[PDB]
Amino acid sequence: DNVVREEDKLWTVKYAPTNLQQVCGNKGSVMKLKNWLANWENSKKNSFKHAGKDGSGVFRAAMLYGPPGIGKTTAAHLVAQELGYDILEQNASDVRSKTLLNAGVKNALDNMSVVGYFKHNLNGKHFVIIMDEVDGMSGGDRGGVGQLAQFCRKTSTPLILICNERNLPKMRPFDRVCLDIQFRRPDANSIKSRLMTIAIREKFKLDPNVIDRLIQTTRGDIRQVINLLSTISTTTKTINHENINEISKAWEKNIALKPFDIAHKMLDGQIYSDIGSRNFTLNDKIALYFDDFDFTPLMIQENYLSTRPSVLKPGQSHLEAVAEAANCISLGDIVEKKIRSSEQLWSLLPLHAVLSSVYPASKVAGHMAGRINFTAWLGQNSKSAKYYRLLQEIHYHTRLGTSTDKIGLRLDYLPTFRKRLLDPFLKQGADAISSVIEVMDDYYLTKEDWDSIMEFFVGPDVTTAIIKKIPATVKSGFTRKYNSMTHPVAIYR
Amino acid sequence: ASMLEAKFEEASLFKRIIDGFKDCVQLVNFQCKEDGIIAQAVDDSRVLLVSLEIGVEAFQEYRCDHPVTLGMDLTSLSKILRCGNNTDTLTLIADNTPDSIILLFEDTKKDRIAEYSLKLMDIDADFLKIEELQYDSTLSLPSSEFSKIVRDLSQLSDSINIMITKETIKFVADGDIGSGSVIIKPFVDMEHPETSIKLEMDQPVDLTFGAKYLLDIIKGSSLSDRVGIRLSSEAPALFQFDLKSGFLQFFLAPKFN
Amino acid sequence: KRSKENLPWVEKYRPETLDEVYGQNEVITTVRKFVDEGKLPHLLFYGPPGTGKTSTIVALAREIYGKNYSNMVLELNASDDRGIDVVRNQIKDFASTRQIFSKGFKLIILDEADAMTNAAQNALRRVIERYTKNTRFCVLANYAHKLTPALLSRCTRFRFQPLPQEAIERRIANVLVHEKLKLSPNAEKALIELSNGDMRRVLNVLQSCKATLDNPDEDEISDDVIYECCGAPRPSDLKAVLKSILEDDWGTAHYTLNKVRSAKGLALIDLIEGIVKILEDYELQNEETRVHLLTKLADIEYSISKGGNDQIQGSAVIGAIKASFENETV
Amino acid sequence: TLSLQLPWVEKYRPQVLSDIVGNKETIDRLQQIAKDGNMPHMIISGMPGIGKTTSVHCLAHELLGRSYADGVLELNASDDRGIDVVRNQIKHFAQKKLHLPPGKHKIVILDEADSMTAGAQQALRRTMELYSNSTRFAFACNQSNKIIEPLQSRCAILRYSKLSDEDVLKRLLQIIKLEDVKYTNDGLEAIIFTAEGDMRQAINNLQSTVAGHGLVNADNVFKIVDSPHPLIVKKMLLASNLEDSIQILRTDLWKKGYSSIDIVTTSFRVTKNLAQVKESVRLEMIKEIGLTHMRILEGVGTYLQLASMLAKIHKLNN
DNA sequence: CCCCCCCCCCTTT
DNA sequence: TTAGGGGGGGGGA
DNA sequence: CCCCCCGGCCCCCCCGGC
DNA sequence: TTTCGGGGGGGCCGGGGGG
Ligand SMILES: Nc1ncnc2c1ncn2[C@@H]1O[C@H](COP(=O)(O)OP(=O)(O)OP(O)(O)=S)[C@@H](O)[C@H]1O
Ligand SMILES: Nc1ncnc2c1ncn2[C@@H]1O[C@H](COP(=O)(O)OP(=O)(O)OP(O)(O)=S)[C@@H](O)[C@H]1O
Numbered sequence A: 001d002n003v004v005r006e007e008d009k010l011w012t013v014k015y016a017p018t019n020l021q022q023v024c025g026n027k028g029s030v031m032k033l034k035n036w037l038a039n040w041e042n043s044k045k046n047s048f049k050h051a052g053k054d055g056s057g058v059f060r061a062a063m064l065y066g067p068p069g070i071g072k073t074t075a076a077h078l079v080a081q082e083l084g085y086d087i088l089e090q091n092a093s094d095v096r097s098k099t100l101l102n103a104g105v106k107n108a109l110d111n112m113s114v115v116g117y118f119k120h121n122l123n124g125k126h127f128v129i130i131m132d133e134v135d136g137m138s139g140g141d142r143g144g145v146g147q148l149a150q151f152c153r154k155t156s157t158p159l160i161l162i163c164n165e166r167n168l169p170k171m172r173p174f175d176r177v178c179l180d181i182q183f184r185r186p187d188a189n190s191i192k193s194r195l196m197t198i199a200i201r202e203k204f205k206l207d208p209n210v211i212d213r214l215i216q217t218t219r220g221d222i223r224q225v226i227n228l229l230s231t232i233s234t235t236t237k238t239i240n241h242e243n244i245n246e247i248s249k250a251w252e253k254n255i256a257l258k259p260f261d262i263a264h265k266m267l268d269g270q271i272y273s274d275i276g277s278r279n280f281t282l283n284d285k286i287a288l289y290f291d292d293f294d295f296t297p298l299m300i301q302e303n304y305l306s307t308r309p310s311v312l313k314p315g316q317s318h319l320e321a322v323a324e325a326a327n328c329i330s331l332g333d334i335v336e337k338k339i340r341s342s343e344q345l346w347s348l349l350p351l352h353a354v355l356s357s358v359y360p361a362s363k364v365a366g367h368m369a370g371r372i373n374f375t376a377w378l379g380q381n382s383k384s385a386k387y388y389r390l391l392q393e394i395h396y397h398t399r400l401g402t403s404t405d406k407i408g409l410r411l412d413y414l415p416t417f418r419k420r421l422l423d424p425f426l427k428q429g430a431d432a433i434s435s436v437i438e439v440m441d442d443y444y445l446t447k448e449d450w451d452s453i454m455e456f457f458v459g460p461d462v463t464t465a466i467i468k469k470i471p472a473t474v475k476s477g478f479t480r481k482y483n484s485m486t487h488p489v490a491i492y493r
Numbered sequence B: 001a002s003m004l005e006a007k008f009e010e011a012s013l014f015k016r017i018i019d020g021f022k023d024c025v026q027l028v029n030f031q032c033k034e035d036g037i038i039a040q041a042v043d044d045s046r047v048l049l050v051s052l053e054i055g056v057e058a059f060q061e062y063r064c065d066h067p068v069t070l071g072m073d074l075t076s077l078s079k080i081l082r083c084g085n086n087t088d089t090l091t092l093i094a095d096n097t098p099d100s101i102i103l104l105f106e107d108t109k110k111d112r113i114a115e116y117s118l119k120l121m122d123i124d125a126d127f128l129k130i131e132e133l134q135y136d137s138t139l140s141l142p143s144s145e146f147s148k149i150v151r152d153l154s155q156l157s158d159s160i161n162i163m164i165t166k167e168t169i170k171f172v173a174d175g176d177i178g179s180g181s182v183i184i185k186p187f188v189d190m191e192h193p194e195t196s197i198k199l200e201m202d203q204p205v206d207l208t209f210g211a212k213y214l215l216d217i218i219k220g221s222s223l224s225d226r227v228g229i230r231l232s233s234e235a236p237a238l239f240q241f242d243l244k245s246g247f248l249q250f251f252l253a254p255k256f257n
Numbered sequence C: 001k002r003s004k005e006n007l008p009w010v011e012k013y014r015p016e017t018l019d020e021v022y023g024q025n026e027v028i029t030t031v032r033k034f035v036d037e038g039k040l041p042h043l044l045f046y047g048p049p050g051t052g053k054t055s056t057i058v059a060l061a062r063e064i065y066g067k068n069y070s071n072m073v074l075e076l077n078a079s080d081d082r083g084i085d086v087v088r089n090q091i092k093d094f095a096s097t098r099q100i101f102s103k104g105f106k107l108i109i110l111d112e113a114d115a116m117t118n119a120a121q122n123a124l125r126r127v128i129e130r131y132t133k134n135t136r137f138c139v140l141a142n143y144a145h146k147l148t149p150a151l152l153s154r155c156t157r158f159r160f161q162p163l164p165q166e167a168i169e170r171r172i173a174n175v176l177v178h179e180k181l182k183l184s185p186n187a188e189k190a191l192i193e194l195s196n197g198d199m200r201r202v203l204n205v206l207q208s209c210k211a212t213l214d215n216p217d218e219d220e221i222s223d224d225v226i227y228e229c230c231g232a233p234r235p236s237d238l239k240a241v242l243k244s245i246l247e248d249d250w251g252t253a254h255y256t257l258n259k260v261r262s263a264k265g266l267a268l269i270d271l272i273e274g275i276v277k278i279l280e281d282y283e284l285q286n287e288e289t290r291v292h293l294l295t296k297l298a299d300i301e302y303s304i305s306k307g308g309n310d311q312i313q314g315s316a317v318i319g320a321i322k323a324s325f326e327n328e329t330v
Numbered sequence D: 001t002l003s004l005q006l007p008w009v010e011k012y013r014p015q016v017l018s019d020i021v022g023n024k025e026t027i028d029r030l031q032q033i034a035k036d037g038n039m040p041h042m043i044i045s046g047m048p049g050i051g052k053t054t055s056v057h058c059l060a061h062e063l064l065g066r067s068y069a070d071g072v073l074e075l076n077a078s079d080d081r082g083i084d085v086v087r088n089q090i091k092h093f094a095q096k097k098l099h100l101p102p103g104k105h106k107i108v109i110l111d112e113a114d115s116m117t118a119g120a121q122q123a124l125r126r127t128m129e130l131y132s133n134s135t136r137f138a139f140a141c142n143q144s145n146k147i148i149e150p151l152q153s154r155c156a157i158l159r160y161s162k163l164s165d166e167d168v169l170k171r172l173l174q175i176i177k178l179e180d181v182k183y184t185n186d187g188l189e190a191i192i193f194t195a196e197g198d199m200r201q202a203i204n205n206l207q208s209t210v211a212g213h214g215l216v217n218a219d220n221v222f223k224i225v226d227s228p229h230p231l232i233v234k235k236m237l238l239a240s241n242l243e244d245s246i247q248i249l250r251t252d253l254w255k256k257g258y259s260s261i262d263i264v265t266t267s268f269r270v271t272k273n274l275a276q277v278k279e280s281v282r283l284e285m286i287k288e289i290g291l292t293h294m295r296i297l298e299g300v301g302t303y304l305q306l307a308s309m310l311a312k313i314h315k316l317n318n
Numbered sequence E: 001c002c003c004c005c006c007c008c009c010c011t012t013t
Numbered sequence F: 001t002t003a004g005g006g007g008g009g010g011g012g013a
Numbered sequence G: 001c002c003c004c005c006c007g008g009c010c011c012c013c014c015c016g017g018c
Numbered sequence H: 001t002t003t004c005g006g007g008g009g010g011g012c013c014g015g016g017g018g019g
């Protein structure tokens, strides 16, 4: 047998934490996870219905999430080993599709460990299923993400899931099934001792005053910090202020910004000045747009009226600059329609970047007056789609009787239908029920069509308060009468 | 090419042995000593343990200078072995500090020699000690019948329950589409002892196991006509197939009560 | 496919040897020198339509390999599947294997490579690099912006210019000799003018002119025949329209434009292009005049490209020209 | 002729770390690593033709030596590199047993790694982590942003800068001495100017000029290498008189056969990078150029549209 | 001990 | 120059 | 006559500029 | 959100071959 010399190993392996206390930072999260896994057995004894002081007794699965290289996997393995559980580990290198998930780990959710039996702690025979890199699985249904979410609800043994981005759409199925544990970027103070110990052991000089800079270079990535030290020390045995700037610039972690950060940066007036534009060039602004080309234009259109500008030309009011920005945004919308047409003119993406984001921002750049808001266009679009679907259903129910298109139905017929369907209840009480039903029968309208019709009106003709004000007895009688009769069908499927 | 030299007079035996458990464990460490070959492998789910013993009598000219350990992936080994022939003699050659092992297929009737090299794997799996245990139930039954029952019951549920009582063996599988049951009792025939189902029940037993694990286990039925199942109250079930001078054993952890 | 005389002239007169390619003397000389001394590099022929790129590469393949070049080269174009899978399997296999027939090197011709996907172009990089000892690549394109920088880094670039007057004249003379045709000097000048450096247009128009003659064995192709077959305005018509626009009142200009167009049913776009060509030579005292002319006429051309009302577009042309030229006084 | 002369980019491809020019500090770091081994996971990024593949291959060769054939696994964009490949072939290579000197490891060279799919990159994470005691990974790419952050965390970042004219001249002089090429200073200056920091391009142009004309002077170099059209476009956009810009457009671009789409795209790029003009003026110019680009994509690609674009740019600039 | 400093991180289909 | 607001954690009158 | 291997459709998810 | 087109990855289906 041949062993590996410690001199042959990577510094990250050579100095990997061995117990939970050596983990730098995120002490609260580590304690929370340890207590959860320690009292998991008691939580099971109570059928996972009684919540303790921490409220973790109602979760059969824990979900650890945070940025890269902060100690998620290390902490998970350390807690699993400390409590004496047998670890069953899965990662992105393994196939975790729905079929493999059901044919693989599914059978281990309520199964004993042969290893835990032949190595004999009372939990030694029980598993701790660690699913690492959950964000590294692709697919909506065949991927098995929803399958893992389902597993998290009925697992008979502890289950720990690890990911990097908890807010991705693919993570939606894990909304409120697991105890969420957040690992944050550790600050320089929580690690300074570790790097100084590594420096003295590795026989190279490191100035403490630059540690804060080094972390800033790695964005709190301890693994990247160790890699940087290992690579730099190969030729430069002393790290001080005389060489910190070059090392930081060469090793800077360039991560794509998120929509809120993109909006904040693009709307800052400083970058649009002569010196600012010379430091942050137009190419940099286009790249910033390209960090997320789908969401950046929506962010800009959402937040371009919520600034105090500092780039106003002489004699120009804020309103005039807003108008110019709005015109440019309209042109950008036209370009976007061109891009997503049958010609697939994706080569126009850079132009879009200028018209939708850079130009209006340069017109209204300044300081954000209030909080930055997420785009409201997506929700409004979904609501409009829902209302149009309901309108189409109503129209094709009433098609046999009316003479109009759906738009004409909304604009013209609906007020009169309101008068002949809703007003009678507010005047004659229950005595009008029959009449209303009669009208419905004349137009093949159902109860759901009635509610949907009542949901369309805007302005002074809003019906929610009026409907809620109706006596409950009248509505109950209306439902009873409608359910006590036979009704026609406009469309026979 | 002299440290380890193990000759099977028939290449079919080793290929069948590998196929017996190639669908459950991928990486396997074979420990070769003067007494023969022993292997122990844990499945990915860590609930099924495969143990293999091959005695010297099974070989023809077994020779081992000093104990050696060979880590092999079973897919590559099966691919290599499928290039041989049953009549051909198969010789395994290994040297000191080997990075690979040589598989030599020789034909006596002809003068055709097929030499293959297989790169060894660096496996750092721990070796577990299995101590002899006295089980409360021991049943020997035909391998074909056991495989048939297992396959029939796996069509209904993901788990199968085995219940052993006085001269009675019951296999149940209850799922969503439906349920199925199979009942057998001990029987012996002098004319056909090979079909004699034998049961020794010190105490009644009741256990449940995963269907996929049993399906993997029954793949060894091609090696032995009979199969021996040992069950304890709360211990892993042992499924054993006997060889000429060795054995293939599957220790399956049951599902928690 | 009963005879070569049944082919369109654009294909009947396809050059078969490098000596039959005109107007690209520098490129032909350089590539011939490369082949003669066995120093052929990876090539990139870039140029506009109908300049001789495909013809040149096919002739080069024939020169290198001879009559059986077809089985000795791997030609792929936009009508074939050229996804990343094709690069990974077919191109890679061809580049790494010896020739079946001879022992010479191997040639891969990626015609119209600007239509290839980015993934396939990226996959081509190491195929080109690894097998350069025995394989060479030729890439043909009209649009260089569709080619990845990595691919361009590995290729030697040759630009095919728009065909000069002399080359078109010589090829026209050869075609006239072959077809037993007569061509007037004015008709020849008009044909060159409308060619715009594309030989395909010359050949197609000449074939149409021959079809137009009542007795092609005795009738000569005059400029009238060319203008009739192509339905294009005469220079005199353009001069008259421009003079009326710049000199007469609106009624006279409108009447003259309508009359000129109705005489032979000319298209407004052809008149616009001819007048633009004429005006480029005009010396203007004010830059604002040129700015207005260019912007307004470009807008009118773009509007015409989508259809619209022809009469309103003609009036717009007249008004734009008059308004622009009113800037030459003050 | 059925014979081929080996290209000089391959004949004089550096075989040792000391023959690579440019990025001196990183090259010395690689030399030290090769000396003492303990190679870590690394990502080498930079622009085309600056010696990334050369650097990786030289490092691997100098580290392994006779064991190179067995201890190196090379995969590039021309090979299959799907998630299945990562999960089977790369994993088998990482698990494989190989006796190496006390300070050496197996190497996986993933050239052009920016083209790898996100699934394969995700699958590589724990493979890198678990088998680091025997295997190390070297990525080479042009755009490091395409490499997912988890992989960047596990690797050492080496960003290659562009080659200066001095290093290019030094390498060209070495190759010229080895080939006894006859040249003139103006010829080498033209080669370097047209190369734009691309060593591969410079060597290819030098070899082509020598083959086609023998003497490497200005005239032959410009006959073989055309003046980059981005500079012509910049001259067109920076002209003060509309007539001058139109003349440049007609004579240097349109009559030379450059397509309208190429002209408009190059104009967009040059305008974006025109640091000498105020950003707002550049934004207006880009708006006009985008209008013209949309018109051209619609099918109206004509000299008149480009002339109108130039007229609008001049009107903006006045 | 509550309060403060200081930072990070979430708003988000 | 720090968008508002909430969470975490070291310091301390 | 029945079971297993492995080529081929088929479906579904994800970029698309430099 | 999403109007083609390319690429990848996973799931069945079925031909052929073997036993
Ligand atoms: N809190 C920490 N303290 C000390 N070292 C750390 C710490 N976090 C990370 N490291 C170092 O970086 C190496 C990797 O740590 P990991 O536990 O893998 O972080 P991670 O958050 O799981 O990264 P990902 O999600 O796989 S990209 C460790 O072996 C340590 O050497
Ligand atoms: N230099 C030329 N000399 C003689 N004929 C030419 C020449 N160029 C084009 N032609 C004629 O036009 C036809 C087409 O020539 P091609 O070589 O196919 O042009 P091309 O540059 O390849 O066109 P593209 O780029 O595919 S649109 C030839 O068959 C010839 O008849």
Ligand SMILES: Nc1ncnc2c1ncn2[C@@H]1O[C@H](COP(=O)(O)OP(=O)(O)OP(O)(O)=S)[C@@H](O)[C@H]1O
Pocket: C125, C150, C153, D008, D009, D010, D012, D013, D014, D019, D020, D021, D022, D046, D047, D048, D049, D050, D051, D052, D053, D054, D055, D141, D142, D171, D199, D200, D203
């Ligand atoms: N620093 C260099 N020193 C000497 N020659 C170089 C250098 N860089 C490039 N070359 C030469 O150009 C050839 C190609 O170099 P490469 O290493 O392939 O460039 P590259 O950066 O890997 O190209 P990409 O990124 O795949 S497009 C080498 O064989 C050398 O002949």
Ligand SMILES: [Mg+2]
Pocket: A072, A073, A074, A132
């Ligand atoms: Mg991790």
Ligand SMILES: [Mg+2]
Pocket: C053, C054, C055
């Ligand atoms: Mg062509």
Ligand SMILES: [Mg+2]
Pocket: D052, D053
């Ligand atoms: Mg390269």
